[PDB]
Design a protein around this nucleic acid. Structure first.
Length: 23
RNA sequence: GGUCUGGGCGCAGCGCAAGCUGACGGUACAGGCC
């Protein structure tokens, strides 16, 4: 893995949870 | 309407050296399919 991948990935998790949380 | 992957740039912080990191930027950028 790399910082970007983690960043790119993490952004998914956070944002993904965003839909659920917001939803 | 949805899903999956990640690469590099800036800034900041720590150190005899070397070396890493930030639910930060970036809700950014890119590509594919149903």
């Amino acid at each position: 893995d790399t910082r970007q991948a983690r960043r790119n990935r993490r952004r998914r998790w956070r944002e993904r949870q965003r839909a659920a949380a917001a939803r």
